UniProtKB/Swiss-Prot annotation, chains A, D, E, F, I, J, K, L, M, N, O, P:
GO terms for cellular component: virion component. This is Head completion protein. It comes from Escherichia phage lambda (Bacteriophage lambda). Pfam families: gpW. Belongs to the lambda phage gpW family. Its main location: virion.
Curated annotation (Swiss-Prot), chains B, H:
It comes from the Viruses. It comes from Escherichia phage lambda. May bind head-to-tail joining protein W and protein U. The keyword Isomerase does not apply. This is Head-tail connector protein FII. Coiled coil: none annotated. Pfam families: Phage_attach (PF05354). InterPro entries: Phage_Head-Tail_Connect_sf, Phage_tail_attach_FII. The gene is FII. It is found in: Virion; Host cytoplasm. One of its GO terms (biological process) is virion assembly. One of its GO terms (cellular component) is host cell cytoplasm. Keywords: Host cytoplasm, Late protein, Viral capsid assembly, Viral release from host cell, Virion.
Swiss-Prot record, chain G:
It comes from Escherichia phage lambda (Bacteriophage lambda). It comes from the Viruses. This is Portal protein B. It is found in: Virion. Proteolytically cleaved by the viral protease during capsid maturation. Forms the portal vertex of the capsid. This portal plays critical roles in head assembly, genome packaging, neck/tail attachment, and genome ejection. The portal protein multimerizes as a single ring-shaped homododecamer arranged around a central channel. Binds to the terminase subunits to form the packaging machine.
Length: 67, 114, 93, 67, 67, 67, 92, 114, 67, 67, 67, 67, 67, 67, 67, 67, 38
């Protein structure tokens, strides 16, 4: 059940990026706010549980050199 | 869609608050019949006294529904907040993105129009 | 290493400005006055001092030592090579 | 559907750039505030997300040197 | 549809510089808040999408050197 | 129209310089707050935009030296 | 060590710019885009480029290619010559 | 034009708010006849009881147009907010750069002047 | 009961990551604000309490080198 | 009385970590806020006050070497 | 009046540590504010006032080495 | 219109120095505030347009040397 | 009156450390706050007047060194 | 008009020095706030503007050195 | 009258140290907030204002070293 | 009128030091606040206009050295 | 390398001032503006 976690986190990254991550809501006496996380940690979380899950390769290993 | 630049923002905020703060109301009867809306319901408490002491304490529910899905709702039809049965009394005019649905309780009283 | 020395010394300086390249190089370096892209050359006359407004800056790269260390490394490699070929190191190098 | 949020994020970048990125909107006790991101992160998001999609060549492999 | 984009961005820059970029508006209950970008990043955006579009030469190559 | 907004930006510099750059204006119920920029970047904008205009000499080419 | 020196010497400068890399090399490293293999550039005289704010050309300082490797070689073939029984100066 | 140095700011602010939140409006009849203005429309709710109980729910629309265009509007003529048809009842006095426009609904009731 | 707060802390980390870490909640007259931590320390807590739990191998003894 | 000290401190650590440490609480007309300690100092408190207890070892002496 | 003073100080340290150090307390119209001190200073106060009192040994005279 | 520009700048400098530059005014329903500029930029502005206008010499060239 | 001055300073130090240094009080229209002094200055002051008064030795002089 | 303006500037400097430089003044509904400078800038302003007028000198040409 | 403000400043120093230096006093509708000074400057004030007074020896002329 | 200036400035220093420099005073509906100068510049001003006036020597010139 | 050396040595110093350039060299680098080429 990591795949839908990936999907939700990637979504939330998208909404935070463009315009649609909500910090506060208020209904004249019914208000609540959420803590805001920086984008860097969002992408780090995305990458970490993206590589950790069973989805395919995204990054290879070092780089050879030849003449 | 609107010559607004502002009402778009208030509509997005309206959707946000409905999603984050609201309940899945299901409607019976009326032209809409079986349908589902996401409306934030509250039950303020109000008391009248009438005679010497005739306290009739009760509640005045409200739903804060969005106008587009609740047009031609009329007044005589009923409503269901989950397992509880209400009936709309009056519909507030649109403030720009929604309106307050004023709710009664129990069976609507007759029609008395003719 | 020779190519790196070529290109490290190639880019002597840079100019930082938000103006047009032609105007910037005219007001900071000079020349233009064309008879009639390739940008513009600059006459290598005497020492010249330019004038700048805030937002502009002429900064010349210090680059790095061309032979930061190469001669000694090549010396060791040639020593090994001469050992391989059986000739004296000095004769080969 | 990568082109979809590619276009959406490009439009969001332009919208923030000119004047239109709404932060908080309030009307008679119904107030909602959206978190904001620096333009640099949005630019990098445009960059590698359009790289990831099948959008055309925009990067070249270093640069050769020859006399 | 880049040319009118250039026009809109240049106009927004002009209003920002002199006096005419509005951060918030309010009318006795209905108010909106706009995220305000800086000036540096806006001029970088102007230059980038101006060179990218069909706009003519503005910056030429490096300066030669001769005796 | 370079003359028009050139003069506009010059006047904006002047009245921001002395006392007249309005930041927020509020009649009861209706308030707006125009964003504010520094004076340095405004001066650079003025310089670049007048030099882009076909106005007269304002710069010279370095400076020669002779004995 | 040979390969590392090769690599460290085979990366002289770095360009960073917002705009497209082809136009970046056109406006910074001369380029000949008027005529994949990216773009070759003529090796002419000294060139000073103009760069808008946000771009930069950084000259990599690299690192000394023989940071003590020669003395380590000296010691190592000293040990080798001890092993083989021939004089160190003959072997090295 | 304004010998105040402050009404210039308030006029700019009024223009900005009308452009950022207002809506178009087409006045019909009156001396203006076909003309288009911009104003921030709103419709507050109001209730009354005409006896032991008579609930007459209604709205009290407002438009807030700038005073330059609203001149010589009188009271008889009418106006359309998009599709909806209202009619001006009262015009608020100048507040410095604009004035609230009080709207009715439907056909204006007679003239009953003389 | 280590698995219990392992799961709870992991869920809380994801919850804070996406958008839904409640900071303050206020009904009319009844408000309460929960203190908020950073994300890094949450990750370190997750890792440490995970390795303390007899969960599977996640760290390997340095790295050998062979020619 | 230090074992229950361990329990209380660890429970407070977990509550602060996930979501369950209250910075302030307000009923209508009656509010109290508590000074909020950081995370690192709390962890040092945990360690220092668990080592002083009789519960088993958690850290050991320095590591030697042998060929 | 020293030993119980130390006991009260230790109780206050634990009190601030978990969650319960009251900062401000407010009833209807009646409210008071208690100033707060960093945990480090309270720890040093505990330490050297415990050393000053006749509490048992907790310090040792440096450390010698021997082959 | 440079001369009255100089006069107004000198005035505004004088009012700013002593007490007579107004940051904001309020009239119980109508308030405005003006962006306040630092004194240094005003002095550079006055010096620049003082040397630019037709008024007499104020600063001469570099100082020579002789024995 | 050095002795009771020292006593009052010690008491104030004690209340400051644990919980009982009041920053401000307010009785529905009768409020008053006091400036808060850092603990470092308070300990310096208490030590200075402690060794200033006629009470006995607390700190001795240098340290010998004998083989 | 330089002499009396210098006198006014000196009086303002003294007034700021003691207690009397009014920052904001407010009546019922009517309030204004005057921007405040530092003291160093006003001091140097007094300095060189008193120098520029013909009042008696306060500077001398460096200093000599004799045996 | 040096003894007068000497004693006054010493008492104020002690008063600020313990708890009592009032910074703001507020009756309903009547608020007065005095300014506050750091303790170090007050200690200096004490130092030089008492050394200028004919108070007893408190300083000594460096220190000689003898074998 | 330098002597009374000295007296007023020394007074103001004394009131600022202990407790008696009012930053702002507010009756209901009528409040004013004065800019609060620091103390170091106050002492520099005191010394400067103290030595500038005709009152006696307070500081002397360098210091000799003899064997 | 020869071209880089001559170029690097050819620029000497720089001046920066928002003041007019002609008057800038007049008030700093001596200049002869009181009596194209600059």
């Amino acid at each position: 059940t990591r795949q839908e976690e990936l999907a939700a986190a990637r979504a939330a990254l998208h909404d935070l990026m463009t315009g649609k991550r909500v910090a506060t809501v208020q209904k004249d006496g019914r208000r609540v706010e959420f803590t805001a996380t920086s984008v860097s940690d969002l992408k780090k979380y995305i990458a970490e549980l993206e590589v950790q899950t069973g989805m395919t390769q995204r990054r290879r290993g070092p780089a050879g050199f030849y003449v | 869609d609107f010559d607004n630049l502002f009402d778009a923002a208030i509509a997005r905020a309206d959707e946000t608050i409905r999603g984050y703060m609201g309940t899945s109301a299901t409607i019976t009867s009326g032209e809409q019949s079986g349908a589902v809306i996401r409306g934030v319901f509250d039950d303020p408490e109000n008391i009248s006294y009438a005679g010497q002491g005739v306290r009739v304490e009760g509640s005045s529910p409200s739903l804060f529904v969005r106008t587009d899905e609740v047009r031609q709702l009329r007044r005589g039809d009923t409503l269901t907040i989950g397992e509880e049965n209400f009936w709309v009394d009056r519909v507030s005019p649109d403030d720009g993105g929604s309106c307050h649905l004023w709710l009664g309780r129990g069976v609507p009283p007759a029609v008395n129009r003719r | 290493q020779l190519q790196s020395a070529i290109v490290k010394a190639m880019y002597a300086a840079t100019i930082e400005s938000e103006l047009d390249t032609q105007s910037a190089m005219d007001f900071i370096l000079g020349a233009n006055s064309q008879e009639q892209y390739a940008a513009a050359p600059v006459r290598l006359g005497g020492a010249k001092v330019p004038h700048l407004m805030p937002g502009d800056s002429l900064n010349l790269q210090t680059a790095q030592d061309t032979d930061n260390g190469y001669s000694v490394f090549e010396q060791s490699l040639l020593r090994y090579i001469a050992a391989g070929l059986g000739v004296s190191y000095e004769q080969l190098s």
